[PDB]
Design a protein around this ligand. Structure first.
Ligand SMILES: OC[C@]1(O)OC[C@@H](O)[C@H]1O
Length: 292
């Protein structure tokens, strides 16, 4: 008979991050004997993900995996997928109610700690910072940001957010303009953190334009090839982030296991429904050339 069908859904198409994720999805399909694909929505508007899922339910797929733009917007349609007998997995949505499992490639608490310790060392434990998130509701960016700020307050009291987190991390242009604006406004701004993959690109371009790389550090999630030029020029300080092909691969792998009626085999937290690895990738001037 035909292979079972596994479909991943990214946050939005046309992104290096999600093209790399898709490579992992497709490779896992070959590895595990499932018909695996990835659909990229036209925008980050969460209803576009809902519409894709409705289409996939209609087409009777076996598993749907997804990087949610908004956990709560998707809950009703995830319930409909589960009612249809479809396995639903998320990445970047710990605690998603209606997903069989959420998969993460890093440990949230350790990841936030690493951001703060890296930032504090370069800032001497003192100064302003800002966080960019993809949106005000996207799940993981906001959990990571929460943990970062909490950790900072409990370790380095002389560091401080210059503003509330800014929902700009999915746009290079907007991230760039925001960074220019903040650098002009806040003399003590010493670091920009972006949890979305486009934000370090925009921030790094702003820092470059203002010739500010020794004053304003840039950290965040990123694809090495996208960030390489700015890393080399020193305008992006460091990527603290993971290989999204691992996420794509793990999603399709776990789907395959469930579809084969097998028990899950990482930290597997049964009651929280989270499968977690700890595969942090640091991206810096010393290793950039090894990474793309
Ligand atoms: O730009 C896409 C993205 O937001 O960046 C990193 C990761 O969180 C991913 O979902």
């Amino acid at each position: 008979a035909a292979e079972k069908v596994v479909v991943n859904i990214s946050k939005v198409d046309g992104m290096p991050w999600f093209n790399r994720m898709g490579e992992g999805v497709v490779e896992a399909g070959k590895a595990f004997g499932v018909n695996a694909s990835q659909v990229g929505p036209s925008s980050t508007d969460a209803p576009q993900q809902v519409k894709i899922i409705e289409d996939l339910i209609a087409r009777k797929v076996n598993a749907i995996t997804i990087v949610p733009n908004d956990a709560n917007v998707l809950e009703p349609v995830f319930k409909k997928a589960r009612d249809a007998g479809i396995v639903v997995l998320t990445n970047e949505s710990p605690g998603q109610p209606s997903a069989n499992w959420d998969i993460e490639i890093i440990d949230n608490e350790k990841f936030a700690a690493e951001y703060v310790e890296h930032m504090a060392k370069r800032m001497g434990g003192k100064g302003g910072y800002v966080i960019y998130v993809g949106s005000l509701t996207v799940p993981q960016h906001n959990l990571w940001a929460d943990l970062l700020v909490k950790y900072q307050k409990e370790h380095y009291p002389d560091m401080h957010e210059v503003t509330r987190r800014m929902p700009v991390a999915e746009s290079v242009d907007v991230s760039r303009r925001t960074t220019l604006d903040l650098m002009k406004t806040y003399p003590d701004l010493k670091a920009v953190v972006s949890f979305g993959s486009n934000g370090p690109i925009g921030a790094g371009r702003a820092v470059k334009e203002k010739r500010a790389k020794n004053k304003v550090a840039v950290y965040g999630m990123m694809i090495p090839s996208q960030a390489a030029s700015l890393i080399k020029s020193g305008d992006i300080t460091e990527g603290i982030t993971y290989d999204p092909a691992s996420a794509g691969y793990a999603l399709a792998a776990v789907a395959s296991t469930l579809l084969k009626g097998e028990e899950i085999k990482a930290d597997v937290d049964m009651d929280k429904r989270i499968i977690r690895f700890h595969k942090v990738l640091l991206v810096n001037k010393d290793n950039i050339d090894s990474l793309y």
